[PDB]
Ligand binder design. Sequence first.
Ligand SMILES: [Mg+2]
Length: 316
Amino acid sequence: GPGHRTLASTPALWASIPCPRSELRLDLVLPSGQSFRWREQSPAHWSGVLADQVWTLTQTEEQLHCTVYRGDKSQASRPTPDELEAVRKYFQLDVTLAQLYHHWGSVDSHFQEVAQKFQGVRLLRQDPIECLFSFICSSNNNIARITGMVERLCQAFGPRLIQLDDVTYHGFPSLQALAGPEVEAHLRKLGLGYRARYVSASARAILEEQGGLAWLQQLRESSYEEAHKALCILPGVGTHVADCICLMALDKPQAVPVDVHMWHIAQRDYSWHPTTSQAKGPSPQTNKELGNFFRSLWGPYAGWAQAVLFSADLRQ
DNA sequence: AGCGTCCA
DNA sequence: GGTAGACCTGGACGC
DNA sequence: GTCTACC
Ligand SMILES: [Mg+2]
């Protein structure tokens, strides 16, 4: 289909949001394992699905430039202010990252050193359903493979949106699409491994046992502790996946995911060891202590600080 | 050379 | 609870 | 990273 746009080539189709590079680096956020659905289809231009539509995003020094492909057989035009609000909300631009970076660096000199090189790593505010099933796919897995699993899952079960060049975009599947008793076998053919059952069983649990889609809004409005505990009822969701969802979709900035990276970071970069367990290796008790350690260190937005160090550790 | 272990 | 080990997949890469 | 089984 039509080409992926670049800002310099189609300026009439773009609009900007005030956004200095100190507040956001697309290249350090979009491919770093928060969302798995963005691709750099042209140099410095990132395309993906945002609020049921395909967008391309690119940055200049002080502005985030956006273009939207509506795909309702309407004439091409720049994004409207209402449409740009969805982009603003997705990047949570109301939160000033420079002041968080100064706070985290002031309490943690290691953070300060890493942060000098990794500016503008902020937290996306993701759709709860997309975030839930993407991080169910993420456990005991690598970001390259996760990215393919999420792509194939959307191609098979999500609505077709539009085609740009040779790339066909799909929306994220609904709960209902993932809940059928045939879905697990299909997801296994798509290479999801043992997480195929987790995806289908979790879609069924939400629909059949938790009151449907409104449950995620309930958890958004609940405390961190309540939301984190509730998510763990889902097959494939343990304390880490629940923290990922809390932090990245349920507005819990203190949630600190603890994966292989953060465990290695704690040991290597902080010389940390658990003090509430004589055995020091990863365990339910020591993983929970490590999350508390990072909250005690970094404060109420510790999960956002985690995202800076996680993004940096992917490139080392 | 490419199997087979390591690892995310 | 605490502990141990199995587990789908496929790129990295030692031997 | 989460699940299951055993202590
Ligand atoms: Mg669970």
